[PDB]
């Protein structure tokens, strides 16, 4: 292999509101816009009508429709979606040449989930049956994928971010390949940081620096109480300590420029005349990544062309307009789209590692690029890694 012409640019979207890639569900093959979703494992489609939706699974209208007689009710921060399950055959048009039987999750009812615009009907949660709902013995769509078909435990993303619409938000574009690495969407050296544990895409950030300037924490407070590499939220999340730490550093080394408290929130966009945006001014971003190597690792860098996400305003479309894409946890840090944007992303699954290389379309300039460089050694290395306090509910869990 080496190449998969027939799967590059099969990812769409509208910036900020998510990648989906086009999927057939039922026989006849329905088409519908799928969230690509590495930060969760489940396959949900809107089966319903719903005021945000073009159009929905019908159930009644597939031959091969089959009924788990089993609901699913999915709670979280921002919403919930819930629905029926059942099993269906499912393709990628744009991916392998392959039709697999996956669980559906077919939504009924939801609150918060579909958003107007993105042009997505359903999310692909392509992380590990731990966090699948209602529980680990819901198989993933992409375990039942390997299962069935002689598709290698690999799949690969290429977030392409991005104006010609003052109206609209703007179109983005990317690649997800299913079964390999094609070497067309990086340049470099592609480096691998282990999966810790196989539930999110977890991984461990041993150093972080501001324009070269190390922040100086007790490494595990950049995975406290986690870090996960995930396709389905927007902006890079730090933990509170290091969102705060991270914040003063960039204002500082920006600080030529007033910016209001609302920018550094996320909820205020800051706007310069065309094409006269200050990057240099806005420091570059480095995240140490565990190398396979014990006392190894590997640095990940992002430019204020990742983290200042465009957003051409009607009210003074003339102007260059940026939301400051990183943003506050309290669940651990999340690589989205932000950091993602910048690499070609692997998540090899059969070797239990995801790597890294430079994206061939990241957004850059003249001066300065997305890298990925190492290694990086350390005598003695602490381990990085946040052990989460075990409840009671989570002890008592019986896994056969
Ligand atoms: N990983 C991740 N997936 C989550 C939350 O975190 C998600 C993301 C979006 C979503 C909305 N706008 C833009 C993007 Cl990139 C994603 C919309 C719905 C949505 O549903 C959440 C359901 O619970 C699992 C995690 C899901
Ligand atoms: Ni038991």
């Known amino acids: 292999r080496g190449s998969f012409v027939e799967m590059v640019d099969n990812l769409r979207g509208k910036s900020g509101q998510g990648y989906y890639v086009e999927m057939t569900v039922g026989s006849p093959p329905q088409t519908l816009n799928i969230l690509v979703d590495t930060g969760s494992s489940n396959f949900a489609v809107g089966a319903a009508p719903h005021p945000f939706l073009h159009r929905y699974y019908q159930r009644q209208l597939s031959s091969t429709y089959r009924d788990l007689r089993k609901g699913v009710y999915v709670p979280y921060t921002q919403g919930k979606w819930e629905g029926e399950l059942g099993t269906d055959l499912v393709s990628i048009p744009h991916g392998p040449n392959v039709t697999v039987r996956a669980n559906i999750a077919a939504i009924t009812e939801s609150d918060k989930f579909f958003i107007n615009g993105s042009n997505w009907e359903g999310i ?8 699948a709902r209602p529980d680990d013995s ?3 769509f992409f375990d039942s994928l390997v299962k069935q078909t002689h ?6 993303l290429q977030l392409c971010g ?7 938000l ?12 094609d070497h067309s969407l990086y340049t470099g050296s592609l480096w691998y940081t282990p999966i810790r544990r196989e539930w999110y895409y977890e991984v461990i950030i041993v150093r972080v620096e501001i324009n070269g300037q190390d922040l100086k924490m007790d490494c595990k407070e950049y995975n406290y109480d986690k870090s996960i590499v995930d396709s389905g939220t927007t902006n890079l999340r730090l933990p509170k300590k290091v969102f705060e730490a991270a914040v003063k550093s960039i204002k500082a080394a920006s600080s030529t ?5 609302g920018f550094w929130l996320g909820e205020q966009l800051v706007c310069w005349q065309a094409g006269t945006t200050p ?3 806005f420091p570059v971003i480095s995240l140490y990544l565990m190398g396979e190597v014990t006392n190894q690792s590997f640095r990940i860098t992002i430019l204020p062309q990742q983290y200042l996400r465009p957003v051409e305003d009607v009210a003074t479309s003339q102007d260059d307009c940026y939301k400051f894409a990183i943003s506050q946890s309290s669940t651990g840090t999340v690589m989205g789209a932000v950091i993602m944007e910048g690499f070609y992303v692997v998540f090899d699954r059969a070797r239990k590692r995801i790597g890294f290389a430079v994206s061939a379309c990241h957004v850059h300039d003249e001066f ?3 890298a990925v460089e190492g290694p990086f050694v350390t005598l003695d290395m602490e381990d990085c890694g946040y052990n989460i306090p075990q409840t009671d509910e989570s002890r008592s869990h019986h896994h056969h």
């Open 138 to 140: 819901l198989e993933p």
């Open 368 to 370: 300065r690029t997305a």
């Open 162 to 168: 991005a104006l010609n619409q003052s109206e609209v």
């Open 170 to 181: 703007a179109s983005v574009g990317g690649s997800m390949i299913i079964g390999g690495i």
């Open 124 to 131: 692909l949660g392509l992380a590990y049956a731990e966090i």
């Open 257 to 261: 420029e007033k910016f209001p408290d």
């Open 279 to 281: 990057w240099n001014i």
């Open 151 to 156: 598709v290698p435990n690999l799949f690969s």
